[PDB]
Amino acid sequence: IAAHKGVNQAPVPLKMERVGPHDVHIEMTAQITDIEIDKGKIYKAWTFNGQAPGPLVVVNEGDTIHFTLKNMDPVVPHSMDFHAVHASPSKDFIDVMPNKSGTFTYPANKPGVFMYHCGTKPVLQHIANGMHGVIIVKPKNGYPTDKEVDREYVLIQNEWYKYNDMNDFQNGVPSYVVFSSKALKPGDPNTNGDTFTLKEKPLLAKVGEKIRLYINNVGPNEVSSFHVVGTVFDDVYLDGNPNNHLQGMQTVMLPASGGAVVEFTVTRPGTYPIVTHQFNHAQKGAVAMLKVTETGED
Amino acid sequence: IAAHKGVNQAPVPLKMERVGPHDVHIEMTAQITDIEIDKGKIYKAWTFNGQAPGPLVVVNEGDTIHFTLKNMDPVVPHSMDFHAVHASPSKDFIDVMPNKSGTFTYPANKPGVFMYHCGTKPVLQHIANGMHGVIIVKPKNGYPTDKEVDREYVLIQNEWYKYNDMNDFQNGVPSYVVFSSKALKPGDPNTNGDTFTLKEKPLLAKVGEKIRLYINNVGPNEVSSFHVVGTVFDDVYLDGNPNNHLQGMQTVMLPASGGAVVEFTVTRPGTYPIVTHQFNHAQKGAVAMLKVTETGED
Amino acid sequence: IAAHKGVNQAPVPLKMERVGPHDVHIEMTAQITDIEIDKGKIYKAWTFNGQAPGPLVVVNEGDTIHFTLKNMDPVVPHSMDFHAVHASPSKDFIDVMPNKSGTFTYPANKPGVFMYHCGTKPVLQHIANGMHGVIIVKPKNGYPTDKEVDREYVLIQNEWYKYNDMNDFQNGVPSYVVFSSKALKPGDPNTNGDTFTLKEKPLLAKVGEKIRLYINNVGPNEVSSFHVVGTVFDDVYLDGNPNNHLQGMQTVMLPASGGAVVEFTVTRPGTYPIVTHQFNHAQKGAVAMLKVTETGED
Ligand SMILES: [Cl-]
Ligand SMILES: [Cl-]
Ligand SMILES: [Cl-]
Ligand SMILES: [Cu+2]
Ligand SMILES: [Cu+2]
Ligand SMILES: [Cu+2]
Ligand SMILES: [Cu+2]
Ligand SMILES: [Cu+2]
Ligand SMILES: [Cu+2]
Ligand SMILES: [Cu+2]
Ligand SMILES: [Cu+2]
Ligand SMILES: [Cu+2]
Ligand code: NA
Ligand code: NA
Ligand code: NA
């Protein structure tokens, strides 16, 4: 895209503020930002806020979201589709033109770990170029295992293809499959979908802890066989809905856009790989690391 | 196949009649019928009854099916395998030769949304060429959410490959991935697996309704990440068995041949896309539309 | 690998012995062994014990495994990762050098049907070349349907690619997808992942029996749509954990490394194919047979 040549829009922080007991404002951007998805490999991503996947959104069950998208892309329209919400797609997930903003309001009625993504046609193109992310909706009544959890992180799986190549997006294997982690609490890492950061800077935990991961496989195209090496998931809540409760799973199958809350115990010090067990994808980047120490700091 | 050149056997209605409180007769054909799977693209499909996927079959839990296949294909044997039934495959799912009929009897003991398909070797060839469909077995005791459902439809996902090309069937990506809808009640649409009909003639619903979809991904080869844009599944019954009850799923993973009953509420007027969230497949056709109006008519 | 030319190390029996009420010794090898994966097609597999998938391991919930790997590979290190266990991957799943042994101890706290595999980088290479298998951990309190089961077998699905070809492993479709069966009781077959043995020597059962299969799809790369033709799964326990209990499934989606206990009734004499319903994979080998006779012997 000629108007994207040389464009690298600096990341912009997500803006969120609660405006009522059940109402939250969220403002994101759509912007074009260079991301190093593998060493030496820059992808001029189509993004929300200069991150791919985009910034984490967390709201409470029953919050209505008053969402503004500021489209900084000089030429391509963009939009926002939150899987969390009940909305009219043709009214509420509509395009915002370059250099314009749009505001849309819709409720997040359901707890869980939801994909969000750009909804502009061709949706595959917008997702594959980077416009994906997660919104977590916290259950009003929690999860039954909340009191057992010592630490928690968010992980997202996505693929990267040949740059803005619709044929490859439709018909080709992913060039990279990657994890990223998005911060829930101050000091948590906040990374983009790349093949290396969560290997070189593992997530941290302490021996004996029960870890919760909020996970989503945003695709665009692949399913995920999510597995933590050296442990078993004590409890899994499919899509993060507390009712969808499995126990003792070695691996959690996630459809494209599928989410889960998974919990597991790390019993010994060491480094625990986190993979999709579709090992072609793991080999192409989709291995993160959890470093478990006696203290929980590196 | 030389004997299929120029062959386009007009669709024949499914014939079904109840012959006892727990016994039903079904007669289908196997026939060769041109189907427009994408605009300008005719596939000379191997079909049941001139539809691909084939006609919907609905029976009650505990019905024994006395099934007749009339093979109108001039040269290729065909057969029928219902995933609903308990049967001896080597006695009851056997081939019916060209211009012959065969009758087989077997019980549908289990509620759900089952694939049916031709079972003639190579099965991949018979399925990929179009010989797939759904049989719904209605649970004797219903689903616990039956009283909440306002409207219901059947959707089927399938792929199309290069024409009768076993190498492509085995080793190639699908050229198209498509939805079709099969009528449950008079006035429901009844369509074939194509890239456009359910976009141009969306399924219809009314604002505020809870919609049930009986869905099956017949493949032949892909899994499906089934998602309705703008809503969340309130309730999901995997394979349509009432016991396999999930709640609040954004997306339902369906194996190849996998079924589900999914229910969701449409809260606002508009058009709601229905996708597999494996967006390569969506881009290659697998987007249907649900048009939600204040009245429920177009 | 030059040092593997001409190498065909004869299979070595798994060695296991109970050493305490909750402690078991297991000794395996890593070895290079020619396996006929399709007729006329020898794969010089990287294996545990000269089998691919490797030998079945069965332990009880709560057993600690004192595992020794004797690496007979003349040049490549190998390791063992049991999905059943809680272990430090970087201490307990570490490499054993050629002509050395290593012993590692870890508990199997969780019931189910777990993948095991070599964990040596690149893991994809070690798995794809054959270093995969299943460990079953028997639940202390059984499964609620135990008393209904008449007969049981273990089946494993795996893929085979072009020989030791990392590009193909990462980016190519599988050349073969196969089932094997591993013996639970004397007289059960014990086979390797190939396209033909379980067609030519079907598993055996008797009319009217309820069959349990312990299944795992070890991949490396594909998911599995596991289906038995002519029946429906009465009960399914995902990953073999008794809590993850589905009923009346036609087909069970297994992620890569995913396991299940599935149970079904065979009501009539005949031969019942067992497939992954991703029919490209079935066509490329992944069809096993269950021969059901009035007596249960051939
Ligand atoms: Cl692993
Ligand atoms: Cl979508
Ligand atoms: Cl089948
Ligand atoms: Cu507001
Ligand atoms: Cu966009
Ligand atoms: Cu593993
Ligand atoms: Cu009759
Ligand atoms: Cu046929
Ligand atoms: Cu979506
Ligand atoms: Cu010992
Ligand atoms: Cu190895
Ligand atoms: Cu089938
Ligand atoms: Na591992
Ligand atoms: Na969408
Ligand atoms: Na079949």
Side-chain angles (χ1 to χ4, degrees):
Chain A
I1 295 171
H4 289 180
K5 298 248 256 283
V7 176
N8 182 17
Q9 295 174 314
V12 168
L14 175 66
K15 293 187 288 193
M16 290 187 58
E17 62 187 353
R18 180 162 295 280
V19 296
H22 306 288
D23 285 277
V24 177
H25 277 200
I26 302 183
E27 176 174 284
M28 283 186 197
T29 65
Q31 60 182 83
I32 303 303
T33 299
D34 284 348
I35 293 177
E36 186 169 37
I37 60 171
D38 183 33
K39 297 212 181 175
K41 184 69 162 183
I42 295 293
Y43 198 104
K44 183 181 299 304
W46 299 8
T47 73
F48 296 105
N49 288 75
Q51 287 181 51
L56 184 63
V57 174
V58 181
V59 301
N60 292 332
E61 182 179 347
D63 281 340
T64 288
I65 295 166
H66 319 178
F67 172 74
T68 298
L69 183 64
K70 180 187 304 181
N71 187 2
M72 302 166 55
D73 187 319
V75 294
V76 189
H78 298 287
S79 58
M80 171 62 85
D81 173 337
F82 289 106
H83 283 195
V85 306
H86 281 82
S88 165
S90 55
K91 295 172 73 173
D92 299 322
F93 298 167
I94 62 171
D95 292 340
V96 177
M97 295 298 115
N99 305 308
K100 305 299 180 177
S101 293
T103 300
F104 311 97
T105 297
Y106 24 57
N109 294 312
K110 302 285 193 191
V113 185
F114 294 98
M115 178 172 178
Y116 71 71
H117 59 84
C118 180
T120 299
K121 291 181 74 185
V123 174
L124 170 62
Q125 186 174 17
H126 287 254
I127 297 177
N129 281 325
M131 307 197 71
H132 42 67
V134 166
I135 174 169
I136 294 171
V137 182
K138 297 183 58 171
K140 195 61 60 237
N141 302 120
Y143 298 88
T145 52
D146 280 347
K147 304 302 168 284
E148 300 169 13
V149 174
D150 295 298
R151 194 186 302 258
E152 60 185 13
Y153 296 110
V154 177
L155 287 174
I156 305 175
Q157 184 177 313
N158 74 267
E159 306 125 40
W160 293 108
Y161 292 84
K162 297 174 187 181
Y163 185 73
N164 194 40
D165 177 344
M166 275 290 279
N167 181 51
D168 196 55
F169 293 172
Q170 287 174 88
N171 296 313
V173 296
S175 287
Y176 308 97
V177 186
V178 297
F179 287 114
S180 59
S181 188
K182 301 296 183 180
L184 285 162
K185 69 182 180 293
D188 283 347
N190 196 76
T191 71
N192 290 311
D194 71 39
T195 62
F196 55 90
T197 294
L198 296 172
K199 293 175 175 65
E200 295 179 356
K201 290 189 265 98
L203 299 177
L204 298 171
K206 299 177 186 185
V207 172
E209 284 184 332
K210 174 164 290 195
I211 310 301
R212 172 179 292 172
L213 301 176
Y214 301 85
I215 66 180
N216 191 286
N217 166 32
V218 299
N221 299 331
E222 306 290 346
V223 304
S224 175
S225 293
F226 186 81
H227 175 75
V228 180
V229 178
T231 188
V232 182
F233 299 118
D234 298 319
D235 295 274
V236 172
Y237 304 97
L238 299 180
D239 273 340
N241 185 290
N243 294 288
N244 301 331
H245 189 173
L246 300 174
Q247 297 183 59
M249 297 288 295
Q250 72 194 295
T251 294
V252 176
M253 178 88 282
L254 299 170
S257 73
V261 168
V262 303
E263 296 169 359
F264 54 91
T265 302
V266 288
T267 62
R268 291 176 179 179
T271 297
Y272 292 65
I274 299 171
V275 306
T276 173
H277 222 284
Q278 290 157 238
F279 254 89
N280 53 346
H281 298 166
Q283 176 61 29
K284 291 189 288 186
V287 178
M289 297 292 182
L290 175 67
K291 180 176 188 181
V292 180
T293 63
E294 295 296 346
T295 68
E297 195 38 54
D298 207 335
Chain B
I1 295 171
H4 289 180
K5 298 248 256 283
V7 176
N8 182 17
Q9 295 174 314
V12 168
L14 175 66
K15 293 187 288 193
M16 290 187 58
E17 62 187 353
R18 180 162 295 280
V19 296
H22 306 288
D23 285 277
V24 177
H25 277 200
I26 302 183
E27 176 174 284
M28 283 186 197
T29 65
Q31 60 182 83
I32 303 303
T33 299
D34 284 348
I35 293 177
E36 186 169 37
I37 60 171
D38 183 33
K39 297 212 181 175
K41 184 69 162 183
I42 295 293
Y43 198 104
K44 183 181 299 304
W46 299 8
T47 73
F48 296 105
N49 288 75
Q51 287 181 51
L56 184 63
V57 174
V58 181
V59 301
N60 292 332
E61 182 179 347
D63 281 340
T64 288
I65 295 166
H66 319 178
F67 172 74
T68 298
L69 183 64
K70 180 187 304 181
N71 187 2
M72 302 166 55
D73 187 319
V75 294
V76 189
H78 298 287
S79 58
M80 171 62 85
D81 173 337
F82 289 106
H83 283 195
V85 306
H86 281 82
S88 165
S90 55
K91 295 172 73 173
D92 299 322
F93 298 167
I94 62 171
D95 292 340
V96 177
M97 295 298 115
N99 305 308
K100 305 299 180 177
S101 293
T103 300
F104 311 97
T105 297
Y106 24 56
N109 294 312
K110 302 285 193 191
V113 185
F114 294 98
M115 178 172 178
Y116 71 71
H117 59 84
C118 180
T120 299
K121 291 181 74 185
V123 174
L124 170 62
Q125 186 174 17
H126 287 254
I127 297 177
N129 281 325
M131 307 197 71
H132 42 67
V134 166
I135 174 169
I136 294 171
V137 182
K138 297 183 58 171
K140 195 61 60 237
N141 302 120
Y143 298 88
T145 52
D146 280 347
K147 304 302 168 284
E148 300 169 13
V149 174
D150 295 298
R151 194 186 302 258
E152 60 185 13
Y153 296 110
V154 177
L155 287 174
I156 305 175
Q157 184 177 313
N158 74 267
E159 306 125 40
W160 293 108
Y161 292 84
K162 297 174 187 181
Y163 185 73
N164 194 40
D165 177 344
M166 275 290 279
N167 181 51
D168 196 55
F169 293 172
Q170 287 174 88
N171 296 313
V173 296
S175 287
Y176 308 97
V177 186
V178 297
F179 287 114
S180 59
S181 188
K182 301 296 183 180
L184 285 162
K185 69 182 180 293
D188 283 347
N190 196 76
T191 71
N192 290 311
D194 71 39
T195 62
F196 55 90
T197 294
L198 296 172
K199 293 175 175 65
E200 295 179 356
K201 290 189 265 98
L203 299 177
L204 298 171
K206 299 177 186 185
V207 172
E209 284 184 332
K210 174 164 290 195
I211 310 301
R212 172 179 292 172
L213 301 176
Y214 301 85
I215 66 180
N216 191 286
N217 166 32
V218 299
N221 299 331
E222 306 290 346
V223 304
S224 175
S225 293
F226 186 81
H227 175 75
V228 180
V229 178
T231 188
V232 182
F233 299 118
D234 298 319
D235 295 274
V236 172
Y237 304 97
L238 299 180
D239 273 340
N241 185 290
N243 294 288
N244 301 331
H245 189 173
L246 300 174
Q247 297 183 59
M249 297 288 295
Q250 72 194 295
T251 294
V252 176
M253 178 88 282
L254 299 170
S257 73
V261 168
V262 303
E263 296 169 359
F264 54 91
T265 302
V266 288
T267 62
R268 291 176 179 179
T271 297
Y272 292 65
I274 299 171
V275 306
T276 173
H277 222 284
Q278 290 157 238
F279 254 89
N280 53 346
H281 298 166
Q283 176 61 29
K284 291 189 288 186
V287 178
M289 297 292 182
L290 175 67
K291 180 176 188 181
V292 180
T293 63
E294 295 296 346
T295 68
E297 195 38 54
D298 207 335
Chain C
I1 295 171
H4 289 180
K5 298 248 256 283
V7 176
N8 182 17
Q9 295 174 314
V12 168
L14 175 66
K15 293 187 288 193
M16 290 187 58
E17 62 187 353
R18 180 162 295 280
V19 296
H22 306 288
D23 285 277
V24 177
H25 277 200
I26 302 183
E27 176 174 284
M28 283 186 197
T29 65
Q31 60 182 83
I32 303 303
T33 299
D34 284 348
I35 293 177
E36 186 169 37
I37 60 171
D38 183 33
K39 297 212 181 175
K41 184 69 162 183
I42 295 293
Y43 198 104
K44 183 181 299 304
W46 299 8
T47 73
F48 296 105
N49 288 75
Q51 287 181 51
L56 184 63
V57 174
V58 181
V59 301
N60 292 332
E61 182 179 347
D63 281 340
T64 288
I65 295 166
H66 319 178
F67 172 74
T68 298
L69 183 64
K70 180 187 304 181
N71 187 2
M72 302 166 55
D73 187 319
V75 294
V76 189
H78 298 287
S79 58
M80 171 62 85
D81 173 337
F82 289 106
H83 283 195
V85 306
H86 281 82
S88 165
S90 55
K91 295 172 73 173
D92 299 322
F93 298 167
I94 62 171
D95 292 340
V96 177
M97 295 298 115
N99 305 308
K100 305 299 180 177
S101 293
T103 300
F104 311 97
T105 297
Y106 24 56
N109 294 312
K110 302 285 193 191
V113 185
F114 294 98
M115 178 172 178
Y116 71 71
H117 59 84
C118 180
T120 299
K121 291 181 74 185
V123 174
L124 170 62
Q125 186 174 17
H126 287 254
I127 297 177
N129 281 325
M131 307 197 71
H132 42 67
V134 166
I135 174 169
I136 294 171
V137 182
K138 297 183 58 171
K140 195 61 60 237
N141 302 120
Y143 298 88
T145 52
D146 280 347
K147 304 302 168 284
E148 300 169 13
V149 174
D150 295 298
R151 194 186 302 258
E152 60 185 13
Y153 296 110
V154 177
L155 287 174
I156 305 175
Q157 184 177 313
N158 74 267
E159 306 125 40
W160 293 108
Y161 292 84
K162 297 174 187 181
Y163 185 73
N164 194 40
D165 177 344
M166 275 290 279
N167 181 51
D168 196 55
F169 293 172
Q170 287 174 88
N171 296 313
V173 296
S175 287
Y176 308 97
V177 186
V178 297
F179 287 114
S180 59
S181 188
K182 301 296 183 180
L184 285 162
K185 69 182 180 293
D188 283 347
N190 196 76
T191 71
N192 290 311
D194 71 39
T195 62
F196 55 90
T197 294
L198 296 172
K199 293 175 175 65
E200 295 179 356
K201 290 189 265 98
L203 299 177
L204 298 171
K206 299 177 186 185
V207 172
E209 284 184 332
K210 174 164 290 195
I211 310 301
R212 172 179 292 172
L213 301 176
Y214 301 85
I215 66 180
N216 191 286
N217 166 32
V218 299
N221 299 331
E222 306 290 346
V223 304
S224 175
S225 293
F226 186 81
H227 175 75
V228 180
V229 178
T231 188
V232 182
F233 299 118
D234 298 319
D235 295 274
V236 172
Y237 304 97
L238 299 180
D239 273 340
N241 185 290
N243 294 288
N244 301 331
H245 189 173
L246 300 174
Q247 297 183 59
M249 297 288 295
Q250 72 194 295
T251 294
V252 176
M253 178 88 282
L254 299 170
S257 73
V261 168
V262 303
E263 296 169 359
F264 54 91
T265 302
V266 288
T267 62
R268 291 176 179 179
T271 297
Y272 292 65
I274 299 171
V275 306
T276 173
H277 222 284
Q278 290 157 238
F279 254 89
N280 53 346
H281 298 166
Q283 176 61 29
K284 291 189 288 186
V287 178
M289 297 292 182
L290 175 67
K291 180 176 188 181
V292 180
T293 63
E294 295 296 346
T295 68
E297 195 38 54
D298 207 335

